[PDB]
Amino acid sequence: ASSTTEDLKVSTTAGAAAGTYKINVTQLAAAQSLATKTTFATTKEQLGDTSVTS
């Protein structure tokens, strides 16, 4: 089946039953993000040294 609303969509797989249900979302889903402080003036220089084998 399909939902009346267009902003959020649902996809039904086999094995599910039929029935109406009303949903509420208070806060939109948020994805955690981690940033690294790699502020170098010139990144063209080799980040790792050639001495390290790995």
Binding site: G15, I23, N24, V25, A35, V52
Partner: protein, 107 residues
């Protein structure tokens, strides 16, 4: 540096030994304070179902629903979804099945 999303999957990255990367990668996400800047702080999904509020982090869930997948792009309000049984696919499958017999009899 984003491997995935979710507070359940806490990511701890270190360096055993490096010329420059050793000091670069030393940081703990649990303390939320460290050398590296944060673009998006730790935030969790929030919803209200069964008359009960849930702040749990996970965005996509398919275990509890047991046969529905929800894709969200924008915030929604009290969206009502009515599920209706479809039987035309069984109809076409039966029609192909009867056609197989008709072809067999013709042969």
């Amino acid at each position: 540096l984003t491997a995935n999303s979710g507070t359940d999957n806490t990511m701890k990255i270190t360096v055993e030994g490096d010329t420059k990367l050793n000091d670069l990668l030393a940081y703990d996400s649990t303390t939320n304070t460290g050398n590296m800047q944060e673009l998006v702080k730790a935030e969790n999904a929030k919803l209200n179902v069964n008359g009960i509020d849930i702040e749990r982090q996970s965005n996509t869930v398919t275990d509890a629903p047991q046969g529905i997948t929800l894709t969200l792009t924008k915030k929604v309000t009290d969206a009502t979804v009515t599920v209706t049984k479809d039987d035309t696919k069984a109809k076409e499958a039966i029609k192909s099945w009867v056609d197989a017999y008709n072809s067999l009899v013709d042969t």
